[model samples]
Target: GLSVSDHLDGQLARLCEVAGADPVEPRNLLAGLLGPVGPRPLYEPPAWPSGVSDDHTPVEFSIAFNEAEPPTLRILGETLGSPPGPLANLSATRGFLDAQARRAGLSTSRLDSVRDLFATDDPQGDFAMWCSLVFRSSRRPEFKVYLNPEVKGVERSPALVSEALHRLGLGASYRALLDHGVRPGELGRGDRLTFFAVDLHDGPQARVKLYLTHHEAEVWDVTRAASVVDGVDVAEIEEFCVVAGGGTRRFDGRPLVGSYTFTEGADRPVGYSIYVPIRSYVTDDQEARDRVAALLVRYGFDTDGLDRAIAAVTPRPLRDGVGLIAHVSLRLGAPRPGVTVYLSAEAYRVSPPRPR
Candidate 1:
């Protein structure tokens, strides 16, 4: 959603000014990023929807979803409701785009697939919103980011940019109060806690690497965030991303936030890990206990609290060939009335992804 479209919208002007094009419009950056235009035009310039053709006219086109066939890059006639002249892709999109491609030196078949995705279109379909730009001067758009064609009756892109930007500006004010020490909300404590340790460097322009003891198959080895200020950095990570992950379930909110339950849908949970709980043995295991009495003298726990702490949470095999113990939690908006009759479910298998 453009309202949730992160920094790219409002930060658009700031970045362009830094890149030496002052007073650029937000839609221009949208066209630059979301593209049927030639890929990677953000770098080394002259991409489609950008740059002038050899004829000295600007390279311009409208994107329409043609679901009857595979998605493609093409040269369409002036109006979007019309047929395309020829299918386009990769270099051909650039070459034929600026009136260059029919004149290339490769096998059409190799060029057919457009083997590159480095910086290209979704290859699926464009999203509900779209952006297009025409340069003021035929060379490169210097001033002004324009929305050459916009989808009528959809949410206006300008207001969406302004909204997210306003929320972000306020966040800059609130972050000053954070102690930078992580907690599980209020005074609550759980087995999972994140603590930040710093090197005490003055300029805090830095990235973080979260080294941990246990990880799921998909989590990164070291969770990281990008160092910002230089238009963020997306080289190996998604940059300048923010999930205030705040806000409440509201009914009257412009972008109302909440969830509803359905009776006719099968939103069933999957994964062997689901509904499976930890089978800990801290209270009863004796031999694993003398190990702890010995640890006080061991001087080991001081340096390896992480090593010594897992004895309780570590799962013991409940059944043959299947002994994975994973912990999952769900929170309700209001506290639930409950008693303590604990039970456990353990898993020793991988859940194959599928449909019913």
Candidate 2:
């Protein structure tokens, strides 16, 4: 365990160096988070493909860009090797997360109270095997937890999430957000909440983001929902869709995703963002890299960060596969107004499903 963490810290230190961010907090927090996952392999395969030179582990890395601050490094994914096996239910999952939150020095009060909403009631249910740690130069790492909103079962999700929002004191705009995501038509089986995430911290930074996936939705459909928060650039949204999704007319492969961020005392959401799964739109990592590079330059960000980030993760050529980088996102009406890259930590070889 000590050796695995030491290895991760070294890789993260290199990542922090290239991104020009501080590594103190991230390095300190790395071991505690890995402590709970029990034992791991002596050497974790390069989560990046073969040609990659570094010993990057399964911890996925993301670099967030905002002209307001230096680039921020966000890392997520699981400990090396296999999971501890499937969790029995939300209750079991919560227990696992509770320990992690504690180890990472995060509060779990809010998550503790919402167990009923996520309970699958079955012997075992879908639970995220991974959690994330977000680091900004100025702040301590923020530990983020993820859950599948539909894992309780699709039929139960809409109502389940509505009540959950109500319990979390976000009921006021639930109707509007849910209806907006399923708009121009009734809710179909494919249209429902895609993910649930909570930042486990005590102060104002403590909040939850509910992600909704709209099937057969268009770019206009996403911007319309984003309009709830003033100052969303609809044109930029369209252009981003074109660059990331390979077209502007409609969503391809997996549906387009929209998310709302809610904080305490706010009857409505405080932020909104859209994510286009770039991997789904391109044929391989090379095409995805080209599109992402173009978008980075078009948005006026230093393209060096992308190149350095890729090198920080793997030495593998970009043509190997699609998952070294996953989703590319744009935040609308949020303090961090910029693009974000979501990297993947494929401990083993993996690929996006072929287009149906």
User: Which candidate should be chosen as best, given lDDT against the real structure?
Assistant: 2
> Candidate 1 lDDT, tens digit per residue, 1-356?
22212322333333233223343443443433333321222222222221111111122221111112211111111111112111232223333222212222222321122112112332211111111232221133211111111111112322222222223232231121112211223211211111111111212221111111121211121111111112212322111001110111111211111111111111210100001012121222232233332322232223132222222223342232111111111111111210111111111122221221
Q: Count steric clashes of candidate 2.
A: 2
lDDT of 2 at 316: 69
List model 2 lDDT by residue over 261-297, tens digit each: 8765564577888888777678777777788889889
Model 1 TM-score on a 0 to 1 scale: 0.16
Instruction: Give the top-scoring candidate (TM-score).
Output: 2
**What are the lDDT figures for the candidates, one per model?**
0.20, 0.66
What lDDT, from 0 to 1, does candidate 2 have? 0.66
Model 1: clashing residue pairs?
25-145, 95-100, 95-101, 96-101, 322-348
Off by over 4 Å in 2: 1-11, 21-59, 78-83, 88-97, 103-105, 123-125, 128-130, 184-188, 264-268, 350-356
Go through the candidates in order and give the clash count of each: 5, 2
TM-score, one value per model = 0.16, 0.80
Model 1 residue-pair collision total: 5
